[PDB]
């Protein structure tokens, strides 16, 4: 009949793929995913808000602050709290840093998943400096919680923005050298141009989000249409793709890195010295000096860490432009100290839904290039 | 830095960026550790004789959701929002 290959969990991420292929050029591929299933939604249902914030930190794991930002803005949207301006600007700066990190890992792991070895090492030296910044800010290497609902917790120490300025200059030169290395590299252009075309009608019906909508025509940015924070005050532009190519989508990711450099530059130049957290002791914990020499601050610290703050009853769905796309969180909260049911819209899940139309008329090396060309981490796809 | 001239010239010639000035090894503009200790300001709270919590009671302002329609010569047919404007090309080099 036809060859029903079973690509197991070995490395060409981690999945299982059963492809009923015709003859080096396929027929019917089915991704069996769910191998990395953990039980995040049931665990958040049996825990509180502040305690189950790290589940939202690590359900996606390459992006590490946009997922925190999405859950914290879900809770701050439901709880009716505007965060202070310096918290909003630090949240914007770290959103752009995490965006730069996720796009550069997607570029390098797509290059290594094809087989090119060296810009992986170059840009991972750059991402080692990124993790040095995360270490100095929070204390963690990767999984900095750091974003409480109620603003940024424990603001950045003195002597950081100069290092971010130096990193901005050197990283602009390094991404220019990446475009020098690849990108009009002839064999790589031969590797990926005409594979995985996506009609914009199918991009809307199959529910593609983020970079796929940029590549397949239609102009759609959450940062431009629905400013959920101080993005309306920083000036940037989004790149759009003419043809539905993979090469086009690569160019779009590189130019989103470059626009992240612009937003980091303006955010450094326009920092207000407002405050760390909100002006409400019943949501954010009070600082430790007032805790020690104050009665009400000790009472609010004690109850706010045992019971937690309550949330008024209601349901909300917010979604922010994570580097993979519209990362969505839908909270349903009975009026209590625990959420009733949370659910996560994953752009990687929505992109992996259309794998049939992205790999109908191509070969299997192009199937590996299609799996690589969408920033799919297989921990977020699981929910 | 602190390399000799010949390999510096071959680095500059094999990639024409004048690579010496920006090379990503940090030498002197590492931020000087053990900074002086900070005093952190307090924002729009703590001002005495206005901080009634009934004013900024952001939790209790959350009203229940309003409803209508249920189970129990007219210019109309509204949209949920005004229609979205077509964007314009930015000026910072539109065709990269």
């Amino acid at each position: 009949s036809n060859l029903t290959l079973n690509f197991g969990p070995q490395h060409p991420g981690v999945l299982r793929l059963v492809m009923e292929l015709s003859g080096e050029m396929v027929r019917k591929c089915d991704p069996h995913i769910g191998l990395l299933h953990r039980g995040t939604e049931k665990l958040i249902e049996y825990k509180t808000y502040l305690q189950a914030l790290p589940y939202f930190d690590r359900l996606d794991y390459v992006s590490m602050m946009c997922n925190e930002q999405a859950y914290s803005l879900a809770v701050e949207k439901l709880l009716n709290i505007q965060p202070p301006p310096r918290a909003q600007w630090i949240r914007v700066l770290f959103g752009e840093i995490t965006r730069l990190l996720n796009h550069i890992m997607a570029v390098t792991t797509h290059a290594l998943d094809i087989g090119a070895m060296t810009p992986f090492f170059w840009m991972f030296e750059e991402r080692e400096k990124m993790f040095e910044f995360y270490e100095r800010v929070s204390g963690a290497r990767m999984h900095a919680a750091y974003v409480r609902p109620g603003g940024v917790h424990q603001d950045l120490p003195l002597g950081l923005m100069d290092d971010i300025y130096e990193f901005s200059k050197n990283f602009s030169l390094r991404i220019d050298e990446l475009e020098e290395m690849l990108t009009n590299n002839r064999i790589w252009r031969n590797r990926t141009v005409d594979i995985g075309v996506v009609t914009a009608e199918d991009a809307l019906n199959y529910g593609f989000s983020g970079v796929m909508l940029r590549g397949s025509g239609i102009q759609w940015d959450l940062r431009k249409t629905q400013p959920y924070d101080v993005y309306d005050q920083v000036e940037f532009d989004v790149p759009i793709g003419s043809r539905g190519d993979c090469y086009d989508r690569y160019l779009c990711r590189v130019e989103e890195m470059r626009q992240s450099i612009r937003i980091i530059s303006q955010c450094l130049n326009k920092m207000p010295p407002g405050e760390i957290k909100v002006d409400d002791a019943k949501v954010s914990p009070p600082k430790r000096a007032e805790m020690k020499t104050s009665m009400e601050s000790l009472i609010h610290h004690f109850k706010l860490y045992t019971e937690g703050y309550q949330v008024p009853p209601g349901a909300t769905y917010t979604a922010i432009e994570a580097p993979k796309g519209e990362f969505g969180v839908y909270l349903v909260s009975d009026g209590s100290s625990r959420p009733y049911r949370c659910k996560i819209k994953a752009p990687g899940f929505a992109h992996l839904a259309g794998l049939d139309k992205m790999s109908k008329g191509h070969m299997l090396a192009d199937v590996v290039a299609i799996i690589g060309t969408q920033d799919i981490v297989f921990g977020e796809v699981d929910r | 830095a602190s390399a000799t001239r010949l390999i510096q010239g071959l680095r500059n010639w094999a990639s024409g960026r004048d690579l010496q000035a920006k090379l990503q090894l940090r030498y002197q503009e590492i931020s000087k550790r053990t900074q002086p200790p900070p005093k952190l300001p307090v924002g729009p709270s703590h001002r005495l004789s206005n901080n009634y919590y009934c004013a900024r009671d952001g939790r209790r302002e959350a009203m229940p959701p309003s409803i209508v329609m249920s189970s129990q010569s007219e210019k109309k047919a509204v949209s949920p929002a005004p229609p979205i404007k077509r964007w314009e090309l930015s000026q910072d080099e539109p065709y990269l």
Partner: peptide
């Protein structure tokens, strides 16, 4: 006083343009 981290009068420019020599 206050001891936050603002920039010192505004930082310099950071380039954001694709640089190629086309040699």
């Amino acid at each position: 006083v206050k001891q936050d981290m603002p920039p010192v009068g505004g930082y310099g420019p950071i380039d954001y343009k694709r640089n190629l020599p086309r040699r």
